[PDB]
Paper text:
D. radiodurans encodes two putative HJ resolvase (HJR) homologs: RuvC (DrRuvC) and YqgF (DrYqgF). The widespread bacterial RuvC and YqgF are evolutionarily connected, and both possess a canonical RNase H-like fold, including five β-strands (β1 to β5) and three α-helices (α1 to α3). The apo structures of RuvC and YqgF from D. radiodurans (DrRuvC and DrYqgF, respectively) were determined by X-ray crystallography.
The DrRuvC dimer structure superimposed well with the TtRuvC structure (the root-mean-square deviation [RMSD] value for 258 Cα atoms is 1.665 Å), EcRuvC structure (the RMSD value for 268 Cα atoms is 1.933 Å), and PaRuvC structure (the RMSD value for 280 Cα atoms is 2.111 Å), in agreement with their high conservations of amino acid sequences. Interestingly, the DrRuvC homodimer exhibits distinct asymmetry in residues 73 to 83 spanning the dimer interface, which is also observed in the TtRuvC apo structure. Although the crystal condition contains 0.2 M MgCl2, only weak metal ion density was observed in the DrRuvC structure. Replacement by alanine of the putative catalytic residues in DrRuvC (D7A, E67A, H139A, and D142A) abolished its HJR activity.
Residue numbers in the entry:
A (entry chain B): 1 to 70, 72 to 111, 118 to 133, 135 to 155
B (entry chain A): 1 to 156
Write the structure that this text describes.
């Protein structure tokens, strides 16, 4: 019933918490974590894991939904992959099962911003930020797919 | 003085521990961790983070040496590699242990002596420098090689 969606990244990390059924979803919480530029990789990784860990303990989600990985550049893919493993580790440390959905799949379940208005409508709020918006989108998308 | 060497991987994680300085060095510990492919990816990144944090907590390394990822031809592959690498880097930060990377160049350079990836010689010079009778596994041997390499770049 409660689900955490994560827009993964290193410079940005979008997190979104919603709760409810397939017909009805209650928005709980959303934020975009931005680790700044001039920190060593481990320091950035420490901030993302600490903050993520803090939110999984309190909100106690029952599922984590994560965006499937798409980018042709390899150094970027390695940097993005480091944040992805630290996110996958935090859930495992919390015991929260992690389901993966593709960008198209979330678009099916709800230049192009239609998606943003569908999440806003189903949670009855107002999202300026593009990263917290997709995380909520993934959280809503898990509810539809969930049996 | 005490250096942990890490050969990072998801299927295989070589960890090597060594204390001393450039002229002579003491062998403390080495192992190769594996994760079965039956586990989901998060379950594997937890085991390595767990066994790394364990060895990191007992032995309290002064520094960590890690094999540099200068492999650079597929984005899909670097992403898969990066997940393991980041869990390793986080355990070190969580332990407060500074991280130094060395290319395969420097390992062989600082061990064989003007070597050019003479892999069997590098292993050979690992057993001799640390007085180890048997070093079978290449990941633990590589991780042992990296620890000696930071010891060669030692500041004093
Ligand atoms: Mg290797």
């Amino acid at each position: 019933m409660r689900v955490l969606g994560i827009d993964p990244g290193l410079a940005n990390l979008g997190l979104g918490l919603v709760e409810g059924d397939v017909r009805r979803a209650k928005h709980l919480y959303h934020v975009c974590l931005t680790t700044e530029s001039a920190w060593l990789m481990p320091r950035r990784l420490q901030y993302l894991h600490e903050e993520l860990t803090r939110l999984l303990t309190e909100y106690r989600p029952d599922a984590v939904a994560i965006e499937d990985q798409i980018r042709r550049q390899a150094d970027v893919a390695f940097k993005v992959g480091q944040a992805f493993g630290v996110v996958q580790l935090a859930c495992a440390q919390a015991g929260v099962p992690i389901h993966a959905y593709g960008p198209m799949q979330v678009k099916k379940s709800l230049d192009k911003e239609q998606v943003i208005y569908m999440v806003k409508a189903s949670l009855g709020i107002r999202l300026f930020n593009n990263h917290a918006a997709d995380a909520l989108a993934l959280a809503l998308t898990h509810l539809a797919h969930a049996p």
